[PDB]
Design a protein around this ligand. Structure first.
Ligand SMILES: *[C@@H]1O[C@H](CO)[C@@H](O[C@@H]2O[C@H](CO[C@H]3O[C@H](CO)[C@@H](O)[C@H](O)[C@@H]3O)[C@@H](O[C@H]3O[C@H](CO)[C@@H](O)[C@H](O)[C@@H]3O)[C@H](O[C@@H]3O[C@H](CS(=O)(=O)O)[C@@H](O)[C@H](O)[C@H]3O)[C@H]2NC(C)=O)[C@H](O)[C@H]1NC(C)=O
Ligand SMILES: *[C@@H]1O[C@H](CO)[C@@H](O[C@@H]2O[C@H](CO[C@H]3O[C@H](CO)[C@@H](O)[C@H](O)[C@@H]3O)[C@@H](O[C@H]3O[C@H](CO)[C@@H](O)[C@H](O)[C@@H]3O)[C@H](O[C@@H]3O[C@H](CS(=O)(=O)O)[C@@H](O)[C@H](O)[C@H]3O)[C@H]2NC(C)=O)[C@H](O)[C@H]1NC(C)=O
Ligand SMILES: *[C@@H]1O[C@H](CO)[C@@H](O[C@@H]2O[C@H](CO[C@H]3O[C@H](CO)[C@@H](O)[C@H](O)[C@@H]3O)[C@@H](O[C@H]3O[C@H](CO)[C@@H](O)[C@H](O)[C@@H]3O)[C@H](O[C@@H]3O[C@H](CS(=O)(=O)O)[C@@H](O)[C@H](O)[C@H]3O)[C@H]2NC(C)=O)[C@H](O)[C@H]1NC(C)=O
Ligand SMILES: *[C@@H]1O[C@H](CO)[C@@H](O[C@@H]2O[C@H](CO[C@H]3O[C@H](CO)[C@@H](O)[C@H](O)[C@@H]3O)[C@@H](O)[C@H](O[C@@H]3O[C@H](CS(=O)(=O)O)[C@@H](O)[C@H](O)[C@H]3O)[C@H]2NC(C)=O)[C@H](O)[C@H]1NC(C)=O
Lengths: 71, 71
């Protein structure tokens, strides 16, 4: 008797998990769009920024950046 | 005589108890078999709900949900 009862449970669970994975694949798609939100325009400039006698070398960097995302 | 009457009682009792268990197995099917589920549609969002330098951070999970079951 036992075998058929187990088969019925695993059939119904199989449908539920399979549908969930298909919906997840469609649910990813919006998140792919954000990967291209930025671009860098023209040359930038580096400048030596560290104070006299200081241990750390530090540089100032300046660039033009355009954001086209929603955040 | 005794042996055959006892043999007959245990045949009839065997039929009764076996059929009772078969009827029990058919009685499980409505509980274990149950189509439909909650389905999650598209992307959801997280938003910061935390305020006023509070001790616990709280977030907001908005998502679209479809209950295909009967409950
Ligand atoms: C960014 O700016 C820093 C200063 O704001 C620079 O630090 C100064 O570096 C001088 C030499 O730079 C050369 O050597 C570096 C390694 O030591 C190298 O990383 C650099 O790319 C570059 O090739 C240094 O001069 C000292 O060393 C010279 C020989 O390398 C020597 O000729 C000098 O007399 C001096 O001993 C500076 O040290 C300071 O020099 C003062 C005098 S003067 O050099 O200003 O005329 C002196 O009074 C002081 O005691 C001494 O420490 C050093 N610091 C300063 C304040 O100038 C850093 O290199 C820059 N980095 C880049 C990439 O440009
Ligand atoms: C590297 O980047 C640093 C920031 O990341 C720069 O620090 C900023 O310096 C500004 C002045 O720099 C000028 O003078 C230097 C000699 O002192 C020279 O080496 C530089 O090349 C440059 O010619 C400073 O601006 C001050 O002066 C402005 C007028 O010119 C005035 O409008 C400002 O209000 C300010 O008084 C920056 O200011 C600081 O500004 C803060 C606001 S914001 O400017 O960041 O928007 C303000 O909150 C703060 O109180 C004030 O002190 C100063 N910025 C910072 C963050 O320190 C540094 O100059 C860069 N180095 C080079 C070589 O370009
Ligand atoms: C969601 O909102 C939350 C509440 O505004 C944010 O949690 C708070 O973050 C503050 C610092 O923010 C930055 O650094 C984070 C890493 O530490 C980073 O995740 C963030 O994206 C952001 O870049 C934090 O301020 C504390 O830390 C600062 C240094 O990072 C410091 O300057 C502050 O003085 C302070 O210590 C908040 O912490 C709480 O600050 C209270 C004072 S005030 O900041 O409100 O003025 C202080 O009284 C309290 O004891 C201390 O815990 C912190 N809040 C909490 C509850 O943890 C969170 O970053 C936001 N984003 C995400 C993705 O969760
Ligand atoms: C997370 O989700 C909760 C609801 O579960 C939501 O609470 C609701 O908040 C709005 C106002 O929110 C705005 O201000 C807060 C700061 O206070 C910001 O963090 C938010 O980003 C918003 O800018 C309230 O207007 C809601 O009202 C209560 O509204 C009820 C009706 S409801 O349909 O809005 O639920 C009324 O019945 C009540 O009388 C009234 O007090 C409030 N709703 C609830 C149920 O709490 C948070 O704002 C959400 N957080 C974020 C960050 O969005």
């Amino acid at each position: 008797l036992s075998g058929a009862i187990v088969a019925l449970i695993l059939v119904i669970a199989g449908v539920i998990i399979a549908i969930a994975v298909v919906l997840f694949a469609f649910g990813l798609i919006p998140g792919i769009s954000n990967q291209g939100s930025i671009q860098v325009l023209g040359s930038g400039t580096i400048t030596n920024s560290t104070a006299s006698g200081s241990s750390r070398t530090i540089y100032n960097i300046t660039i033009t950046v355009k954001n086209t995302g929603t955040t």
